[PDB]
Short mmCIF file of C-alpha atoms and ligand atoms in Angstrom, two decimals:
data_model
loop_
_atom_site.label_atom_id
_atom_site.label_comp_id
_atom_site.label_asym_id
_atom_site.label_seq_id
_atom_site.Cartn_x
_atom_site.Cartn_y
_atom_site.Cartn_z
CA UNK A 1 -41.96 104.07 119.74
CA UNK A 2 -43.19 104.77 115.92
CA UNK A 3 -46.72 104.74 117.48
CA UNK A 4 -48.68 107.72 118.43
CA UNK A 5 -49.40 108.05 121.96
CA UNK A 6 -52.91 107.84 123.07
CA UNK A 7 -53.58 111.90 123.10
CA UNK A 8 -51.86 112.09 119.56
CA UNK A 9 -54.31 109.48 118.34
CA UNK A 10 -57.33 111.19 119.61
CA UNK A 11 -55.98 114.41 118.05
CA UNK A 12 -55.38 112.41 114.77
CA UNK A 13 -59.22 111.54 114.68
CA UNK A 14 -60.46 115.16 115.21
CA UNK A 15 -58.31 116.08 112.44
CA UNK A 16 -59.80 113.66 110.23
CA UNK A 17 -62.85 116.33 109.98
CA UNK A 18 -59.95 118.77 108.30
CA UNK A 19 -62.36 119.19 105.08
CA UNK A 20 -65.54 119.69 106.73
CA UNK A 21 -67.25 122.96 107.90
CA UNK A 22 -67.72 122.86 111.64
CA UNK A 23 -64.15 121.37 112.64
CA UNK A 24 -63.79 121.22 116.27
CA UNK A 25 -61.14 123.64 116.49
CA UNK A 26 -61.12 124.26 120.21
CA UNK A 27 -60.99 120.56 120.98
CA UNK A 28 -57.81 120.28 118.63
CA UNK A 29 -56.36 123.20 120.32
CA UNK A 30 -56.82 121.40 123.51
CA UNK A 31 -55.57 118.19 122.36
CA UNK A 32 -52.49 119.42 120.51
CA UNK A 33 -51.25 121.38 123.56
CA UNK A 34 -52.30 124.65 121.94
CA UNK A 35 -50.88 124.11 118.99
CA UNK A 36 -54.19 124.22 116.53
CA UNK A 37 -52.28 126.11 113.90
CA UNK A 38 -49.19 124.04 113.66
CA UNK A 39 -51.03 120.63 113.40
CA UNK A 40 -53.90 121.99 111.20
CA UNK A 41 -51.60 123.76 108.76
CA UNK A 42 -49.31 120.46 108.68
CA UNK A 43 -52.31 118.50 108.20
CA UNK A 44 -53.46 120.55 105.30
CA UNK A 45 -50.22 120.87 103.99
CA UNK A 46 -49.72 116.97 103.53
CA UNK A 47 -53.65 116.65 102.51
CA UNK A 48 -52.25 119.08 99.39
CA UNK A 49 -49.16 117.76 98.85
CA UNK A 50 -47.52 121.22 99.37
CA UNK A 51 -44.69 119.68 100.83
CA UNK A 52 -43.46 117.79 97.60
CA UNK A 53 -44.54 120.30 95.40
CA UNK A 54 -42.54 122.94 97.20
CA UNK A 55 -39.90 120.80 97.95
CA UNK A 56 -40.46 122.08 101.61
CA UNK A 57 -38.23 120.51 104.19
CA UNK A 58 -40.47 118.69 106.83
CA UNK A 59 -38.40 119.58 109.56
CA UNK A 60 -38.53 123.25 108.61
CA UNK A 61 -41.99 123.46 107.61
CA UNK A 62 -42.88 122.30 111.77
CA UNK A 63 -40.02 125.04 113.05
CA UNK A 64 -41.54 127.65 111.10
CA UNK A 65 -45.17 126.75 112.03
CA UNK A 66 -44.24 126.52 115.70
CA UNK A 67 -42.72 129.84 115.52
CA UNK A 68 -45.36 131.50 113.75
CA UNK A 69 -47.76 130.04 116.23
CA UNK A 70 -45.85 131.06 119.24
CA UNK A 71 -46.02 134.84 117.90
CA UNK A 72 -49.68 134.94 118.44
CA UNK A 73 -50.79 135.85 121.77
CA UNK A 74 -51.84 133.58 124.17
CA UNK A 75 -53.42 136.11 126.32
CA UNK A 76 -55.73 137.55 123.78
CA UNK A 77 -59.24 136.10 123.96
CA UNK A 78 -59.83 136.20 120.06
CA UNK A 79 -56.97 137.38 117.78
CA UNK A 80 -54.86 134.10 118.83
CA UNK A 81 -53.33 130.98 117.03
CA UNK A 82 -56.83 129.30 117.48
CA UNK A 83 -58.71 131.88 115.21
CA UNK A 84 -55.56 131.87 112.72
CA UNK A 85 -56.09 127.97 112.68
CA UNK A 86 -60.03 128.46 112.14
CA UNK A 87 -59.35 130.72 109.29
CA UNK A 88 -57.18 128.42 107.53
CA UNK A 89 -58.90 125.40 107.89
CA UNK A 90 -61.98 127.54 106.59
CA UNK A 91 -60.21 129.10 103.52
CA UNK A 92 -59.29 125.23 103.03
CA UNK A 93 -62.53 123.93 102.63
CA UNK A 94 -63.48 127.17 100.81
CA UNK A 95 -60.76 126.33 98.39
CA UNK A 96 -62.31 122.85 97.57
CA UNK A 97 -65.58 124.25 96.60
CA UNK A 98 -66.89 122.17 93.53
CA UNK A 99 -67.10 125.77 91.53
CA UNK A 100 -63.59 126.31 92.03
CA UNK A 101 -62.02 122.90 91.02
CA UNK A 102 -59.16 122.93 89.17
CA UNK A 103 -59.07 126.60 88.86
CA UNK A 104 -56.43 128.19 91.12
CA UNK A 105 -52.59 126.80 90.64
CA UNK A 106 -50.78 124.93 93.49
CA UNK A 107 -48.95 128.87 94.34
CA UNK A 108 -52.06 130.42 94.70
CA UNK A 109 -53.45 127.78 96.89
CA UNK A 110 -50.33 128.08 99.02
CA UNK A 111 -50.42 131.82 99.04
CA UNK A 112 -54.41 131.44 100.35
CA UNK A 113 -53.26 129.26 102.65
CA UNK A 114 -50.06 130.92 104.14
CA UNK A 115 -51.98 134.32 104.25
CA UNK A 116 -54.78 132.75 106.17
CA UNK A 117 -52.19 131.51 108.59
CA UNK A 118 -50.17 134.69 109.17
CA UNK A 119 -53.13 137.04 108.67
CA UNK A 120 -53.43 137.87 112.39
CA UNK A 121 -49.93 137.21 113.55
CA UNK A 122 -48.83 139.29 116.76
CA UNK A 123 -52.25 140.97 117.20
CA UNK A 124 -52.30 142.88 120.50
CA UNK A 125 -55.72 142.48 121.09
CA UNK A 126 -56.93 146.12 120.10
CA UNK A 127 -58.18 147.57 116.92
CA UNK A 128 -56.27 149.48 114.41
CA UNK A 129 -58.37 153.00 115.35
CA UNK A 130 -57.29 152.28 119.01
CA UNK A 131 -53.47 151.94 117.84
CA UNK A 132 -54.09 155.08 115.81
CA UNK A 133 -55.88 157.21 118.98
CA UNK A 134 -53.00 156.16 121.45
CA UNK A 135 -50.30 157.16 119.51
CA UNK A 136 -48.88 153.71 119.44
CA UNK A 137 -45.64 152.80 117.75
CA UNK A 138 -47.25 150.33 115.74
CA UNK A 139 -49.48 153.26 113.87
CA UNK A 140 -46.53 155.69 113.77
CA UNK A 141 -44.59 152.96 112.06
CA UNK A 142 -47.24 152.16 109.30
CA UNK A 143 -48.64 155.57 109.29
CA UNK A 144 -52.08 154.92 110.54
CA UNK A 145 -52.52 152.85 107.19
CA UNK A 146 -53.94 149.45 107.75
CA UNK A 147 -51.72 148.99 110.99
CA UNK A 148 -51.99 146.11 112.06
CA UNK A 149 -52.38 144.41 108.36
CA UNK A 150 -49.14 145.67 107.62
CA UNK A 151 -47.83 144.46 110.76
CA UNK A 152 -48.99 140.99 110.26
CA UNK A 153 -47.39 140.73 106.90
CA UNK A 154 -43.77 141.89 108.39
CA UNK A 155 -43.93 139.30 111.01
CA UNK A 156 -45.29 136.55 108.94
CA UNK A 157 -42.49 137.24 106.47
CA UNK A 158 -39.78 137.90 109.16
CA UNK A 159 -40.17 134.81 110.71
CA UNK A 160 -38.86 132.93 108.08
CA UNK A 161 -35.58 134.51 108.56
CA UNK A 162 -35.39 132.40 111.86
CA UNK A 163 -33.25 128.98 112.44
CA UNK A 164 -34.57 126.66 109.91
CA UNK A 165 -37.68 128.61 109.27
CA UNK A 166 -37.30 129.48 105.46
CA UNK A 167 -40.25 127.18 104.21
CA UNK A 168 -39.99 129.00 100.87
CA UNK A 169 -36.05 128.35 100.43
CA UNK A 170 -36.73 126.13 97.14
CA UNK A 171 -38.80 128.42 95.57
CA UNK A 172 -37.38 130.29 92.59
CA UNK A 173 -37.56 133.93 92.81
CA UNK A 174 -40.31 134.20 90.12
CA UNK A 175 -42.34 131.73 92.57
CA UNK A 176 -41.25 133.68 95.71
CA UNK A 177 -42.07 137.10 94.20
CA UNK A 178 -45.79 136.06 92.91
CA UNK A 179 -46.20 134.32 96.18
CA UNK A 180 -45.16 137.13 98.04
CA UNK A 181 -47.51 139.72 96.03
CA UNK A 182 -50.46 137.31 96.18
CA UNK A 183 -49.90 137.04 100.11
CA UNK A 184 -49.53 140.82 100.62
CA UNK A 185 -52.63 141.72 98.54
CA UNK A 186 -54.76 138.78 100.67
CA UNK A 187 -53.94 140.10 103.92
CA UNK A 188 -54.22 143.73 103.36
CA UNK A 189 -57.85 142.73 102.08
CA UNK A 190 -58.80 141.49 105.71
CA UNK A 191 -58.91 145.13 106.69
CA UNK A 192 -62.55 145.60 107.55
CA UNK A 193 -62.07 149.15 106.13
CA UNK A 194 -61.77 147.50 102.61
CA UNK A 195 -64.81 145.40 103.35
CA UNK A 196 -67.36 147.41 101.34
CA UNK A 197 -65.09 147.75 98.28
CA UNK A 198 -64.50 144.09 98.47
CA UNK A 199 -68.05 142.97 98.55
CA UNK A 200 -68.73 145.82 95.73
CA UNK A 201 -66.15 143.87 93.41
CA UNK A 202 -67.19 140.83 94.27
CA UNK A 203 -71.13 141.36 93.18
CA UNK A 204 -69.85 142.95 90.22
CA UNK A 205 -68.13 139.66 89.55
CA UNK A 206 -71.12 137.66 90.49
CA UNK A 207 -72.88 140.07 87.58
CA UNK A 208 -70.28 139.16 85.08
CA UNK A 209 -69.85 135.77 86.29
CA UNK A 210 -68.83 133.16 83.20
CA UNK A 211 -68.56 129.61 83.99
CA UNK A 212 -66.62 126.88 81.70
CA UNK A 213 -67.23 123.68 79.89
CA UNK A 214 -68.10 121.67 83.44
CA UNK A 215 -69.70 124.94 85.09
CA UNK A 216 -66.57 126.01 86.69
CA UNK A 217 -65.54 129.55 87.59
CA UNK A 218 -63.52 131.39 85.01
CA UNK A 219 -60.97 133.85 85.75
CA UNK A 220 -58.55 135.38 83.56
CA UNK A 221 -56.62 138.15 84.55
CA UNK A 222 -54.58 138.46 87.81
CA UNK A 223 -57.21 141.13 89.12
CA UNK A 224 -60.07 138.60 88.85
CA UNK A 225 -57.87 135.97 90.68
CA UNK A 226 -56.82 137.86 93.42
CA UNK A 227 -60.05 139.49 94.18
CA UNK A 228 -61.83 136.03 94.51
CA UNK A 229 -58.75 134.83 96.86
CA UNK A 230 -58.95 138.40 98.59
CA UNK A 231 -62.88 137.69 99.25
CA UNK A 232 -62.17 133.87 100.13
CA UNK A 233 -60.12 134.52 102.95
CA UNK A 234 -62.07 137.47 103.77
CA UNK A 235 -65.04 135.16 104.09
CA UNK A 236 -63.24 132.76 105.94
CA UNK A 237 -62.25 135.61 108.54
CA UNK A 238 -65.86 136.29 109.08
CA UNK A 239 -67.13 132.86 108.96
CA UNK A 240 -67.73 132.35 112.75
CA UNK A 241 -71.44 133.23 112.32
CA UNK A 242 -71.76 130.58 109.64
CA UNK A 243 -70.58 127.83 112.07
CA UNK A 244 -72.57 125.52 114.14
CA UNK A 245 -74.04 127.61 116.92
CA UNK A 246 -71.89 125.79 119.72
CA UNK A 247 -68.82 127.00 117.47
CA UNK A 248 -70.07 130.50 116.93
CA UNK A 249 -70.84 131.19 120.61
CA UNK A 250 -67.61 130.57 121.72
CA UNK A 251 -66.42 132.93 119.32
CA UNK A 252 -68.80 135.74 120.30
CA UNK A 253 -67.66 135.25 123.77
CA UNK A 254 -64.15 135.70 122.95
CA UNK A 255 -64.47 138.49 120.59
CA UNK A 256 -66.84 140.11 123.21
CA UNK A 257 -64.20 139.72 125.96
CA UNK A 258 -61.40 141.02 123.82
CA UNK A 259 -63.48 144.30 122.92
CA UNK A 260 -64.82 144.75 126.33
CA UNK A 261 -61.23 144.64 127.30
CA UNK A 262 -60.34 147.40 124.97
CA UNK A 263 -63.47 149.56 126.05
CA UNK A 264 -62.14 149.13 129.45
CA UNK A 265 -58.72 150.80 128.29
CA UNK A 266 -60.59 153.35 126.65
CA UNK A 267 -63.01 154.24 129.28
CA UNK A 268 -59.94 154.66 131.63
CA UNK A 269 -58.08 156.75 128.98
CA UNK A 270 -61.26 158.73 129.07
CA UNK A 271 -61.82 157.86 125.36
CA UNK A 272 -65.57 157.54 123.80
CA UNK A 273 -66.39 153.76 123.87
CA UNK A 274 -69.09 152.01 121.35
CA UNK A 275 -71.83 150.15 122.80
CA UNK A 276 -70.05 147.35 120.90
CA UNK A 277 -67.01 147.56 123.47
CA UNK A 278 -68.81 149.05 126.64
CA UNK A 279 -69.40 145.86 128.86
CA UNK A 280 -71.84 148.13 131.03
CA UNK A 281 -74.07 149.36 127.89
CA UNK A 282 -73.71 146.27 125.60
CA UNK A 283 -76.43 144.25 123.88
CA UNK A 284 -74.38 141.10 122.60
CA UNK A 285 -77.19 139.55 121.18
CA UNK A 286 -78.37 142.82 119.14
CA UNK A 287 -74.77 143.22 117.78
CA UNK A 288 -74.30 139.49 116.39
CA UNK A 289 -77.66 140.49 114.70
CA UNK A 290 -76.53 143.76 113.40
CA UNK A 291 -73.11 141.92 112.61
CA UNK A 292 -74.92 139.60 110.35
CA UNK A 293 -77.49 141.63 108.69
CA UNK A 294 -75.28 144.41 107.69
CA UNK A 295 -72.02 142.63 107.14
CA UNK A 296 -71.96 138.69 107.35
CA UNK A 297 -74.97 137.83 105.30
CA UNK A 298 -74.28 140.45 102.66
CA UNK A 299 -71.18 138.98 102.15
CA UNK A 300 -71.87 135.23 102.16
CA UNK A 301 -75.14 136.13 100.28
CA UNK A 302 -72.65 137.02 97.35
CA UNK A 303 -70.20 134.60 97.66
CA UNK A 304 -73.06 131.80 97.67
CA UNK A 305 -74.06 133.53 94.50
CA UNK A 306 -70.73 133.49 92.94
CA UNK A 307 -70.42 129.36 93.70
CA UNK A 308 -74.03 128.97 93.71
CA UNK A 309 -75.27 126.34 95.13
CA UNK A 310 -72.08 124.87 96.66
CA UNK A 311 -72.44 127.54 99.88
CA UNK A 312 -76.20 126.83 100.18
CA UNK A 313 -75.68 125.10 103.49
CA UNK A 314 -73.27 127.60 105.11
CA UNK A 315 -75.97 130.11 104.20
CA UNK A 316 -78.71 128.17 105.73
CA UNK A 317 -76.78 127.98 108.91
CA UNK A 318 -75.99 131.85 108.97
CA UNK A 319 -79.38 132.32 108.80
CA UNK A 320 -80.68 130.03 111.42
CA UNK A 321 -78.02 131.55 113.70
CA UNK A 322 -79.11 134.89 113.12
CA UNK A 323 -82.54 133.56 113.99
CA UNK A 324 -81.47 131.93 117.16
CA UNK A 325 -79.77 135.56 118.49
CA UNK A 326 -82.75 137.52 117.14
CA UNK A 327 -85.03 135.59 119.54
CA UNK A 328 -82.62 135.49 122.45
CA UNK A 329 -83.05 139.33 122.34
CA UNK A 330 -84.99 140.08 125.77
CA UNK A 331 -87.88 142.65 126.36
C1 IHM B 1 -62.72 147.15 118.60
C2 IHM B 1 -62.96 146.78 117.17
O1 IHM B 1 -62.12 146.09 116.41
N1 IHM B 1 -64.27 147.17 116.89
C3 IHM B 1 -65.05 147.23 115.45
C4 IHM B 1 -65.48 148.14 114.99
C5 IHM B 1 -66.03 148.32 113.77
C6 IHM B 1 -66.32 146.86 113.02
C7 IHM B 1 -65.55 145.51 113.69
C8 IHM B 1 -65.69 144.35 112.88
C9 IHM B 1 -66.07 143.95 111.77
C10 IHM B 1 -65.93 142.77 111.47
N2 IHM B 1 -65.27 142.25 112.63
C11 IHM B 1 -64.69 140.93 112.93
C12 IHM B 1 -63.20 140.81 113.85
C13 IHM B 1 -62.33 141.72 112.96
C14 IHM B 1 -61.82 142.98 113.20
C15 IHM B 1 -61.05 143.72 112.60
N3 IHM B 1 -60.21 143.20 111.14
O2 IHM B 1 -60.16 144.13 110.04
C16 IHM B 1 -61.34 141.94 110.64
C17 IHM B 1 -62.07 141.11 111.63
C18 IHM B 1 -65.51 139.96 114.10
C19 IHM B 1 -65.53 138.75 113.94
C20 IHM B 1 -66.41 137.83 114.96
C21 IHM B 1 -67.67 138.72 115.48
O3 IHM B 1 -68.53 137.99 116.37
C22 IHM B 1 -68.85 136.45 116.43
F1 IHM B 1 -68.98 135.94 115.55
F2 IHM B 1 -67.53 135.73 117.15
C23 IHM B 1 -67.57 140.05 115.36
O4 IHM B 1 -68.77 140.47 116.31
C24 IHM B 1 -69.00 141.84 115.97
C25 IHM B 1 -70.27 142.19 116.69
C26 IHM B 1 -69.52 142.71 118.03
C27 IHM B 1 -70.79 143.44 117.39
C28 IHM B 1 -66.78 141.10 114.59
N4 IHM B 1 -65.12 143.31 113.79
C29 IHM B 1 -64.83 145.88 114.88
ZN1 ZN B 2 -56.87 140.85 111.14
ZN1 ZN B 3 -58.63 137.51 111.65
#
């Protein structure tokens, strides 16, 4: 009575690393009875005093979080609640980077974290292209346009209507409309088809980079604010390779399982399969190296530049991991 159970205490101790890059999220997933998203989100909300700032009733926050977590598929290897929790915690750490100290408002912080929590809800385990090519209801509903991302948003928002789930019930119409717009802009930016444009804009920003007195990033207009937030959650979404190898490897195993599974369906449907999704002709090591060289490193290198030198350690880990997988390539 009043005191945590032994498993709850062990979980609480793991959660003490919530502000660190490399949180044992899989461990937390096990300790919380597969409730990584709910506990990590609750920990972050209270850490950031978001409940008080936005007058979010605690029972309501917990109810919505568990409901949201329940709408992630536990039978999906990668795009599940653990990934959601990871992206959330990673965005949380990124928001704390010294270069962005005092830059964003509480509402923007709330938008970035909420966006992260719902960015992949109800993911079926197959890609937009697969959905489009199989004439799936989802693809027809959203006209082949950022199919999954539009769906994650619609679900994320619709769940607020369930019993005692409206965590934004006390925000004014102004706060809600602004919050909603920012969340929509952020989740839509997670669609990989927008990667090049986002990176281009981020690079341009690093080019025109301008700080303040204390050397903190200066962002005037909404376009700049939202771009940085969009790239932030995007970085968090593509952060697996920048985490300690032990974590990175579990992510790779999961994504490969999900991809090979899709490949198996395409093979049966008689569709063409990418080496990436072909369990028969697949080079996991090469795929990760390509992934890092063409996508992850160019992204994180530009982000490192924007907040230089705050992300120096993350970049070093990415490069060490890249070399690890490279040397793993058989011959
Ligand atoms: C079947 C399928 O989706 N194929 C496909 C085709 C082209 C690019 C990508 C793609 C680009 C970024 N990712 C994300 C996961 C991700 C997927 C989609 N969006 O909207 C955002 C992120 C992604 C995250 C982690 C990965 O590996 C490891 F870190 F766990 C990964 O591995 C890529 C290598 C297998 C070769 C890809 N996925 C995926
Ligand atoms: Zn996604
Ligand atoms: Zn994702």
